[PDB]
Amino acid sequence: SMDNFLTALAMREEDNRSGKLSSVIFIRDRNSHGQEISGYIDYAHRLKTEDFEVYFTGKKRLLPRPTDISFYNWDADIAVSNSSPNYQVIADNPEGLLFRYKRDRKILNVDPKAQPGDNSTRITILTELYVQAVIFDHIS
Ligand SMILES: [Zn+2]
Ligand SMILES: [Zn+2]
Ligand SMILES: [Zn+2]
Ligand SMILES: [Zn+2]
Ligand SMILES: [Zn+2]
Ligand SMILES: [Zn+2]
Ligand SMILES: [Zn+2]
């Protein structure tokens, strides 16, 4: 069933689809072969390309992938920044991991504890689904 995580995504689905809101989902967890993974997911683009019923009904867990905005698997020596339709990866250094929302050109600092940026909020989701889940919400 849905805990805080899927409820949070369900609450944001309509506005992500329509473009009123653009959410980036940070998940740190593990793959199914015992390695930690983390990465940043463009929620609106995933909605556009996948039937989210699979996730809402618990048929599959949402997880970050190498094709997402950025993705890490330290055990596997993988760290990639492919960007996404809605976000460009613009910096990654001690001052922050920075994405730019392409439509409005505003900068998001997407470190899991970051001060997120203009018209962005960050919320940690308490969920048993993942080691850490953080949602950044950008109001365009
Ligand atoms: Zn798209
Ligand atoms: Zn697409
Ligand atoms: Zn739906
Ligand atoms: Zn999948
Ligand atoms: Zn490890
Ligand atoms: Zn940090
Ligand atoms: Zn706002």
PDB file of N, CA and C and ligand atoms in Angstrom, residues 44-46 48-49 85-86, ligand 1:
ATOM      1  N   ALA A  44       8.161  14.841 -13.773  1.00  0.00           N
ATOM      2  CA  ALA A  44       7.263  15.140 -14.880  1.00  0.00           C
ATOM      3  C   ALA A  44       7.626  14.312 -16.115  1.00  0.00           C
ATOM      4  N   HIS A  45       8.934  14.168 -16.402  1.00  0.00           N
ATOM      5  CA  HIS A  45       9.295  13.403 -17.601  1.00  0.00           C
ATOM      6  C   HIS A  45       8.989  11.920 -17.419  1.00  0.00           C
ATOM      7  N   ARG A  46       9.254  11.367 -16.230  1.00  0.00           N
ATOM      8  CA  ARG A  46       8.873   9.978 -15.990  1.00  0.00           C
ATOM      9  C   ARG A  46       7.367   9.780 -16.183  1.00  0.00           C
ATOM     10  N   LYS A  48       5.399  11.208 -18.141  1.00  0.00           N
ATOM     11  CA  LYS A  48       5.055  11.400 -19.544  1.00  0.00           C
ATOM     12  C   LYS A  48       5.380  10.134 -20.329  1.00  0.00           C
ATOM     13  N   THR A  49       6.335   9.346 -19.813  1.00  0.00           N
ATOM     14  CA  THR A  49       6.907   8.210 -20.529  1.00  0.00           C
ATOM     15  C   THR A  49       6.493   6.854 -19.934  1.00  0.00           C
ATOM     16  N   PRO A  85      14.809  16.292 -19.885  1.00  0.00           N
ATOM     17  CA  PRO A  85      14.088  17.295 -20.658  1.00  0.00           C
ATOM     18  C   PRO A  85      13.844  18.600 -19.912  1.00  0.00           C
ATOM     19  N   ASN A  86      13.762  18.537 -18.566  1.00  0.00           N
ATOM     20  CA  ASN A  86      13.359  19.718 -17.798  1.00  0.00           C
ATOM     21  C   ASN A  86      14.505  20.328 -16.996  1.00  0.00           C
TER      22      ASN A  86
HETATM   23 ZN    ZN B   1       9.483  14.469 -21.352  1.00  0.00          ZN
END
